[PDB]
């Protein structure tokens, strides 16, 4: 059968590979941008390539092997380092200057960790139907016996590092049942490894694609005509007998099936019109799940003014405004001597920031840094890079997050095909939504579902 795959991110390339392995080689991959890789994507900043999207292989060293790890660490050997979060208690900055006492902070972290552990015990006892689920915040209130969760600046920043920095939305919106504990770490292991290689974390996608798509023997560039870049799909028409896909440039293509891999945000946006309209059950499951936004703001300075050394890689700023420029990282190992800092924001701060100029964002950040390092002469940053994933029509966010209210059955409806229209992508990953390995395994699983239906008539 002929199958059109919409999108050449990790899931689309992964699904097309699996299909090709089943012998379905009459594929046509239509990608909106001028390149493959989607959310795994590097860029030049301050004369070095940094990741705008995914940056870590998460879940390493555990009971099962994360399928992405071997490719990154053995097949391609991309340069990488295990992140160590053990010294955060020594690096929490006060809103007005200097760090807090490490012992006080270590005890707040312990209290937070302990509450989360009680939440893991509780989650284990909830019903599979989801009828007793609750937000992580409700679990925090119950376990601490209070009418509110973390509320002082230090407790809030600790809370934000533990939850929002992973999920990109606050604990009060997040499903406890479906995030605590999290399968990625329970299955693959607790460590995470930061990829810092000039070829980019995206190399993994190019490696996979080259195992079945044709590449130039000199270039190494993909030249297979089954891959067409700059093809923005805007309409998908389907019937019991086949499908037609129209692109923004006016091309029109036909196939027996279409495998949609565009992000959940794209599907919530209407960029692609389905005709007929997707059924209500599908539409509701789509709008109930969340597409989160995690913004990596890179900054480059004329000189270093922050600490370097053991345990100095990650540091937090405890603002009285929750989530305001709170989580920082410095790259003494990754980008020795570059004078770059990375501050991450999400959700509401991400949408506000994407809406204002880089200069204005730079100015707000300089004010925070100056409060943090009152003893230093802090130079203004020389360059800033603000990724605008939520504003980009081909992504509309960075990764899905599971909200309280959606149960496993409704989440599974996200994966479900509609006639001949199949779906894949990180938001269809059975237990790894939000991750690169989740996009990868989702392409394989979605392809298998289509192969069984198409080749064995077992749908």
Ligand X SMILES: C=C=CCNCCCCNCC=C=C
Ligand Y SMILES: *[C@@H]1O[C@H](CO)[C@@H](O[C@@H]2O[C@H](CO)[C@@H](O)[C@H](O)[C@H]2NC(C)=O)[C@H](O)[C@H]1NC(C)=O
Ligand Z SMILES: *[C@@H]1O[C@H](CO)[C@@H](O[C@@H]2O[C@H](CO)[C@@H](O[C@@H]3O[C@H](CO[C@H]4O[C@H](CO)[C@@H](O)[C@H](O)[C@@H]4O)[C@@H](O)[C@H](O)[C@@H]3O)[C@H](O)[C@H]2NC(C)=O)[C@H](O[C@H]2O[C@H](C)[C@H](O)[C@H](O)[C@H]2O)[C@H]1NC(C)=O
Q: Give me the residues that bind ligand FAD (CB under 6 A), please.
A: 6-12, 30-33, 38-40, 53-56, 58, 232-233, 261-263, 266, 271-272, 294, 296, 389, 394-395, 398-399, 425-426, 434-436, 438-439
CB of 404 to ligand Y, least distance (A): 34
Q: Which is nearer to a copy of itself, 73 or 391 (CB)?
A: 391
Contact 158, 111 (CB under 8 A): no
Residue 324, Cβ density class (10 Å: 0-12 exposed, 13-18 middle, ≥19 buried) = middle
Candidate residues 97, 98, 276, 374; the one interacting with a copy of itself per rule CB under 8 A: 276
The residues in 329-358 that bind ligand Y, with binding defined as CB under 6 A, are none
CB atoms within 10 A of CB 376: 13
d(C-alpha 35, C-alpha 359), whole Å: 28
H or E stretch at 399: strand 399-401
Contact 56, 192 (CB under 8 A): yes
Q: Which is nearer to ligand FAD, 39 or 108 (CB)?
A: 39
Q: Which is nearer to ligand FAD, 30 or 372 (CB)?
A: 30
On the question of a cis peptide bond just before residue 181, with omega within 30 degrees of 0, the verdict is: yes
d(C-alpha 266, C-alpha 244), whole Å: 19
Residue 196 backbone dihedrals phi, psi, to 5 degrees: -135, 75
Q: Does 124 sit near a copy of itself (CB under 8 A)? A: yes
Candidate residues 43, 73, 106, 244; the one interacting with ligand Y per rule CB under 6 A: 73
CB atoms within 10 A of CB 34: 7
Q: Which is nearer to ligand Y, 61 or 268 (CB)?
A: 61
58 is catalytic: yes
Give the Cα-Cα-Cα angle 44, 398, 260 (nearest 5 degrees): 110
CB atoms within 10 A of CB 161: 20
CB of 200 to ligand Z, least distance (A): 18
CB of 396 to ligand X, least distance (A): 15
Candidate residues 13, 15, 46, 60; the one interacting with ligand Y per rule CB under 6 A: 60
In 3D space, the residue among 358, 39, 280, 334 whose CA is nearest the CA of residue 168 turns out to be 39
CB of 91 to ligand X, least distance (A): 15
Going residue by residue from 370 to 409, which x/- string records binding to a copy of itself, judged by CB under 8 A?
--------------------x-----xx-----xxx-xxx
Sign of CA dihedral 432, 436, 441, 443: positive
Q: Which is nearer to ligand FAD, 150 or 170 (CB)?
A: 170
The catalytic position among 51, 58, 202, 426 is 58
d(C-alpha 442, C-alpha 433), whole Å: 9
Candidate residues 152, 211, 367, 382; the one interacting with a copy of itself per rule CB under 8 A: 152
The residues in 338-367 that bind a copy of itself, with binding defined as CB under 8 A, are 348, 351-352, 355-356
Nearest residue to ligand Y, by Cβ distance, number only:
73
The residues in 223-262 that bind a copy of itself, with binding defined as CB under 8 A, are 238-241
Catalytically active residues are: 58
Applying CB under 6 A, which residues contact ligand Y?
Answer: 60-61, 73-74
């Amino acid at each position: 059968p002929r199958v059109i795959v919409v999108g050449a991110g990790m899931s689309g390339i992964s699904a097309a590979k699996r299909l090709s392995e089943a012998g379905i080689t009459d594929l046509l991959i239509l990608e909106a941008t001028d390149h493959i890789g989607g959310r795994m994507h590097k860029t030049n900043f301050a004369g070095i390539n940094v990741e705008l999207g995914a940056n870590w292989v998460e879940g390493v060293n555990g009971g099962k092997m994360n399928p992405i790890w071997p490719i990154v660490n053995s097949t391609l050997k991309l340069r990488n380092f295990r992140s160590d979060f053990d010294y955060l208690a020594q690096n929490v900055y006060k809103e007005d200057g200097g760090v807090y006492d490490e012992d006080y902070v270590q005890k707040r972290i312990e209290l937070a960790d302990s509450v989360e552990e009680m939440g893991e015990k509780l989650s284990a006892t909830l019903h599979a139907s989801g009828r007793d689920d609750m937000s992580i915040l409700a679990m925090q209130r119950l376990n601490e016996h209070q009418p509110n969760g973390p509320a002082t600046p230090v407790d809030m920043v600790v809370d934000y590092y533990k939850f929002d920095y992973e999920f990109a939305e606050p604990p009060r919106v997040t499903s406890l049942q479906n995030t605590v504990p999290l399968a990625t770490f329970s299955d693959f292991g607790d460590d995470v490894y930061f990829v810092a290689d000039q070829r980019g974390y995206e190399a993994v996608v190019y490696y996979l694609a080259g195992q079945y798509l044709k590449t130039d023997d000199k270039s190494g560039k993909i030249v297979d005509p089954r891959l067409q870049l700059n093809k923005v799909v805007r309409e998908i028409k389907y019937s019991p007998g086949g499908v037609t896909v129209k692109t923004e440039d006016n091309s029109v293509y036909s196939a027996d099936y279409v495998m949609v891999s565009a992000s959940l945000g794209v599907l919530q946006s209407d960029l692609i019109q389905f005709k007929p309209k997707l059924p209500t059950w599908k539409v509701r499951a789509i709008y109930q799940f969340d597409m989160a936004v995690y913004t990596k703001i890179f900054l480059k300075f004329p000189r270093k003014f922050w600490p370097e050394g053991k345990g100095r890689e990650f540091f937090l700023y405890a603002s009285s405004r929750r989530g305001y420029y709170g989580v920082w990282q410095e790259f003494e190992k990754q980008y020795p001597d570059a004078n770059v800092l990375l501050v991450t924001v999400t959700d509401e701060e991400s949408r506000r920031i994407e809406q204002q100029s880089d200069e204005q964002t730079k100015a707000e950040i300089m004010q925070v840094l100056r409060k943090m390092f009152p003893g230093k002469d802090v130079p203004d940053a020389t360059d800033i890079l603000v990724p605008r994933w939520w504003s980009d029509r081909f992504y509309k966010g960075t990764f899905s997050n599971w909200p309280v209210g959606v149960n496993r059955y409704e989440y599974d409806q996200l994966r479900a095909p509609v006639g001949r229209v199949y779906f894949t992508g990180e938001h269809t990953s059975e237990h790894y939504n939000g991750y690169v390995h989740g996009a990868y395994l989702s392409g394989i699983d979605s392809a298998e579902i289509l192969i069984n239906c198409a080749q064995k008539k077992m749908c």
